[PDB]
Amino acid sequence: PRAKTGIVRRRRHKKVLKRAKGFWGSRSKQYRNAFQTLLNAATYEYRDRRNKKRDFRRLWIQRINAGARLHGMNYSTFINGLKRANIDLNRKVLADIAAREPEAFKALVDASRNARQ
Amino acid sequence: HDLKPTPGSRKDRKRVGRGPGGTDKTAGRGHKGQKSRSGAGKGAFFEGGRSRLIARLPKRGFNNVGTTYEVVKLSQLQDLEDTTFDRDTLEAYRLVRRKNR
Amino acid sequence: AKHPVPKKKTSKSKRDMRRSHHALTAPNLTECPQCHGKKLSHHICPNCGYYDGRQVLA
Amino acid sequence: FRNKKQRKQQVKLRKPGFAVAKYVRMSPRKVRLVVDVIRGKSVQDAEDLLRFIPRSASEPVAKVLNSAKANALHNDEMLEDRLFVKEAYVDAGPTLKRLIPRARGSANIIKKRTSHITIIVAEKGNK
Amino acid sequence: IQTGGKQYRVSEGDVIRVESLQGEAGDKVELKALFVGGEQTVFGEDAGKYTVQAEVVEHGRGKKIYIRKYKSGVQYRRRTGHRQNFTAIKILGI
Amino acid sequence: KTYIPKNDEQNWVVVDASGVPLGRLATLIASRIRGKHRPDFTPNMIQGDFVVVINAAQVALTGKKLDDKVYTRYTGYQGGLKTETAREALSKHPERVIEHAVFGMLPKGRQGRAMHTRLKVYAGETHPHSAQKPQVLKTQPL
Amino acid sequence: KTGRKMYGQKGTGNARHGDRSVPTFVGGGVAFGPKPRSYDYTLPRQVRQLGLAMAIASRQEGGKLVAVDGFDIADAKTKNFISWAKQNGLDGTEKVLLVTDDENTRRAARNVSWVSVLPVAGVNVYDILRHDRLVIDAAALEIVEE
RNA sequence: AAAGGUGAAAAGAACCCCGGGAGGGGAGUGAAAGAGAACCUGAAACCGUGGACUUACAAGCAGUCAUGGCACCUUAUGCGUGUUAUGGCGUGCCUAUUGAAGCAUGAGCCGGCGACUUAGACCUGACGUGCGAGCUUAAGUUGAAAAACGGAGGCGGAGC
RNA sequence: GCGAGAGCUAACUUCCGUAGCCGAGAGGGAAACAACCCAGACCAUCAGCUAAGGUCCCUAAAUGAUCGCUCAGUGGUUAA
RNA sequence: GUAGGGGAGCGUUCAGUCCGCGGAGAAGCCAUACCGGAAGGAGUGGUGGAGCCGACUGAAGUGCGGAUGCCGGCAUGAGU
């Protein structure tokens, strides 16, 4: 017996259309293109988590030595140093201590130099 | 009157092997059945044929189809059954019903 | 055939980017000195029929 | 409150300073040009502008205005000499597809569109 | 960080992956890397001296996150739900 | 969780270009501009101090300031709009020799451009100090 | 209904069509549509035996019941059929099946939800398992075979 | 070819305003009238009005991740919803290919229609059930708001 | 790539043998770029160590250390 | 992980059964920051104006973006 596609397709779509918002023109008002925009969307969505991990860590490092070099070292040097002192093992946050607590960072800085030369 | 779908007529299950779901050509987004060219919308490439050894193969033998006798094995009588009588009939129900031959 | 033809439908956007210049300019109606009804500067007042005196019949 | 069904009875729902000319045989696109200058002002002015504006979209846009008024008063008891054009806008009614011959057999279909010119007047006031 | 915090602070509720020990108040104890209890800027090991104690606050089911993939030309489309679990804990250590 | 932004800062440094190897110097300028030891040290927007260079006209090169260093510049539809000049040839506008060797060692995006804005060279010396009324921490090269 | 040749195999401007009577044509045929048939297969005898047998059990294992003539009736009435029903546990809350010949007896059963009549043990695994309580009644089909 | 649908019932809108009219606004009927006769529901492309955040050194598959500004906070003030700026990354889909962003094919957009089926006591095999060394009916028969009967015939049972 | 025929020891040329890769392979590198180099993506994380490659500024990381070589911009398009 | 094989499910209509639901308001429609591993499901609000959810089982004209597809509506070109 006859079995339409009634109400079953509308839904399916609005499901997508709706995912689309700040999607410029057609990419948000028309299905077809709306949806299609949403495959490349996949490409990005995914490959972006695996990724922002690389990115952020890059913002971290950049500071960790724009503070390190702020006394006379350098991420490179400043870091093998704390490493020298198995005692030190932050890496994570370490940068922040560079961004807000100048006092501390000072400590760790010189702390390394004296685990160096 | 709480809630109770009830067991019985409706509570009757299939069997767990009784019968699997058909097959509609669409296993995920990514179906476009058949080979991928040179096969479709028709039916005749067949599977039989007369050149594929069928031919090239010799033979004339000669068909006849003489008589076909009914084998009433020996164990069929001895071992068990107490001369429930062979004869020409009683053998039927003994089970050795072939007829025609 | 129709030799030159367009390479795509133009955005409802762009199709508008264009039109930002078809906006009419509202006449500069001025108030008649007599009938005090608004007229079109330099022409005869369609209402009273004046232009310092009365030219056009009522 | 109550429930929808009830409200529909307790209320009649009216449209203050509203008037609409439906099915005006003209491209909405044309008419909007006109309505566009009248939107938002001394209804006195709207009256005045129209009489002069050159576009033939003007008469209609008139007839609807001198009714969105005539209602603003009669049926609404308003104070006309403070009646400005609250809102005006044009929408498209049916469309009169008509077939038209062409070069060598081919044919075409003309769109003789239409418009719903609704115009809404309100008492201005500042406070 | 990579589980089981560290650092100084003032005692807040923070979310970190499951801590096994369910229930609540499960006085959690963490080593310590760095910290300034009274400004006392203290680094590794020399830090081990002090420690942190927290109390399992609540366990949680993170916000849903659909993991999607797509490689073009080769069809291939993968929609799959997901959301990670966590353990909120209230900081309060030495 | 990582740190945020600031603003109410605009360190106003004055590097000297005298005798110093244009490039080196440049890199330095290009450094601070974009973000030195950086405050919140962040991308999104720039916090990289304002740079003022004096002299310039007395920057320094090496084997070629006649040979090799040819600042090219191709105008209108290149109907032979191939215009180039020797760097020494930039004795008409030393100012640009620098200014136009740095906008290179600076991002090229929207922000990037808005960043040449903070670089501000002067072919002179003391007279330059005139277009200078704010801070002026002279952090020469090395 | 539809003609057979259409436009131009080529050079018409986008198409390639046969009739206006095909699957891909609003108004045409229904490729792979449904046509009349029977879907009637003969389920092996021994099962149609282990059928109601097996069902009868279930019923006995629960709400079974028999009848040996119902002098209790007298006339169509039905009224009193309900009567008997009463003091027979047939409150009127259960689907009741009364397999039994007795032309006059059945005659009293034009009431809903309760019962549904059923002649000369012309039973049926369905009905039985369908309704609640079974009035196997006539021991007819119930005792004595082969 | 296409083309259905006021209400329960015409009670189908007396009378008044604007208009040559169409069209509308009140009043009144009605349970309801943007249920009013271009009359059930009324999606979507498409057109428009109003509002909120934005936009006039900018090189853009049109997203995505990050951060900040702004607005609002009925599954929602503690997380968010909408929006935006700057940064990073980022060669539409499908098909046909050795190889596609591809200056290679298809396609204006939306909605609805639109493609691996049905049959034959047919063949072969996986799962399952009924019996089991035996297992079954077909035509038909008689009943049927049900199905029993019906062994003709078929399959194991010796092969060469 | 290696081993040959062919072809001008010509071609993203052609035909075999053989190993790897793309095809059916995302990720880092090679400016960009199927197959070259490193390496095979179960999902989640503002955590960590490494490969090939890299560490003046545009980008992450020593304008590093020591002994030399060339002033050509060689480096950043061939030969008798 | 492409052709291909194997597994488990989601959804539509019709049908038999169970529990039921509805004019203080069903289906359909429209909105939404909930839930589920996906297909999808729920809650609340708006419209609507009468038939309709959920569960087991059976049968299917059963799921779509593509075919210069088909019908219909409406765009661009362009107040040209």
From Swiss-Prot, chain C:
<dbReference type="GO" id="GO:0003735">
    <property type="term" value="F:structural constituent of ribosome"/>
</dbReference>
<dbReference type="InterPro" id="IPR044957">
    <property type="entry name" value="Ribosomal_bL32_bact"/>
</dbReference>
<dbReference type="GO" id="GO:0015934">
    <property type="term" value="C:large ribosomal subunit"/>
</dbReference>
<feature type="binding site">
    <location>
        <position position="48"/>
    </location>
    <ligand>
        <name>Zn(2+)</name>
    </ligand>
</feature>
<comment type="function">
    <text>Forms a cluster with L17 and L22, and with L22, a pair of 'tweezers' that hold together all the domains of the 23S rRNA. Interacts with the antibiotic troleandomycin which blocks the peptide exit tunnel.</text>
</comment>
<keyword id="KW-0689">Ribosomal protein</keyword>
<dbReference type="GO" id="GO:0008270">
    <property type="term" value="F:zinc ion binding"/>
</dbReference>
<feature type="zinc finger region" description="C4-type">
    <location>
        <begin position="32"/>
        <end position="48"/>
    </location>
</feature>
<dbReference type="GO" id="GO:0019843">
    <property type="term" value="F:rRNA binding"/>
</dbReference>
<dbReference type="InterPro" id="IPR002677">
    <property type="entry name" value="Ribosomal_bL32"/>
</dbReference>
<keyword id="KW-0863">Zinc-finger</keyword>
<feature type="binding site">
    <location>
        <position position="45"/>
    </location>
    <ligand>
        <name>Zn(2+)</name>
    </ligand>
</feature>
Swiss-Prot record, chain D:
<comment type="similarity">
    <text>Belongs to the universal ribosomal protein uL22 family.</text>
</comment>
<comment type="subunit">
    <text>Part of the 50S ribosomal subunit. Contacts protein L32.</text>
</comment>
<keyword id="KW-0687">Ribonucleoprotein</keyword>
<keyword id="KW-0699">rRNA-binding</keyword>
<protein>
    <recommendedName>
        <fullName>Large ribosomal subunit protein uL22</fullName>
    </recommendedName>
</protein>
<dbReference type="GO" id="GO:0003735">
    <property type="term" value="F:structural constituent of ribosome"/>
</dbReference>
<dbReference type="GO" id="GO:0019843">
    <property type="term" value="F:rRNA binding"/>
</dbReference>
<comment type="function">
    <text>This protein binds specifically to 23S rRNA; its binding is stimulated by other ribosomal proteins, e.g. L4, L17, and L20. It is important during the early stages of 50S assembly. It makes multiple contacts with different domains of the 23S rRNA in the assembled 50S subunit and ribosome.</text>
</comment>
<dbReference type="GO" id="GO:0022625">
    <property type="term" value="C:cytosolic large ribosomal subunit"/>
</dbReference>
<dbReference type="InterPro" id="IPR001063">
    <property type="entry name" value="Ribosomal_uL22"/>
</dbReference>
<dbReference type="InterPro" id="IPR036394">
    <property type="entry name" value="Ribosomal_uL22_sf"/>
</dbReference>
<keyword id="KW-0689">Ribosomal protein</keyword>
UniProtKB/Swiss-Prot annotation, chain E:
<keyword id="KW-0699">rRNA-binding</keyword>
<comment type="similarity">
    <text>Belongs to the bacterial ribosomal protein bL21 family.</text>
</comment>
<dbReference type="InterPro" id="IPR001787">
    <property type="entry name" value="Ribosomal_bL21"/>
</dbReference>
<keyword id="KW-0694">RNA-binding</keyword>
<comment type="subunit">
    <text>Part of the 50S ribosomal subunit. Contacts proteins L15 and L20.</text>
</comment>
<protein>
    <recommendedName>
        <fullName>Large ribosomal subunit protein bL21</fullName>
    </recommendedName>
</protein>
<dbReference type="GO" id="GO:0005840">
    <property type="term" value="C:ribosome"/>
</dbReference>
<dbReference type="InterPro" id="IPR036164">
    <property type="entry name" value="bL21-like_sf"/>
</dbReference>
<keyword id="KW-0687">Ribonucleoprotein</keyword>
<dbReference type="GO" id="GO:0003735">
    <property type="term" value="F:structural constituent of ribosome"/>
</dbReference>
<keyword id="KW-0689">Ribosomal protein</keyword>
<dbReference type="GO" id="GO:0006412">
    <property type="term" value="P:translation"/>
</dbReference>
UniProtKB/Swiss-Prot annotation, chain G:
<protein>
    <recommendedName>
        <fullName>Large ribosomal subunit protein uL4</fullName>
    </recommendedName>
</protein>
<keyword id="KW-0699">rRNA-binding</keyword>
<comment type="function">
    <text>Makes multiple contacts with different domains of the 23S rRNA in the assembled 50S subunit.</text>
</comment>
<comment type="function">
    <text>One of the primary rRNA binding proteins, this protein initially binds near the 5'-end of the 23S rRNA. It is important during the early stages of 50S assembly.</text>
</comment>
<dbReference type="GO" id="GO:0006412">
    <property type="term" value="P:translation"/>
</dbReference>
<dbReference type="GO" id="GO:0019843">
    <property type="term" value="F:rRNA binding"/>
</dbReference>
<comment type="subunit">
    <text>Part of the 50S ribosomal subunit. Contacts proteins L15 and L34.</text>
</comment>
<dbReference type="GO" id="GO:0003735">
    <property type="term" value="F:structural constituent of ribosome"/>
</dbReference>
<comment type="similarity">
    <text>Belongs to the universal ribosomal protein uL4 family.</text>
</comment>
<dbReference type="GO" id="GO:0005840">
    <property type="term" value="C:ribosome"/>
</dbReference>
<dbReference type="GO" id="GO:1990904">
    <property type="term" value="C:ribonucleoprotein complex"/>
</dbReference>
<keyword id="KW-0694">RNA-binding</keyword>
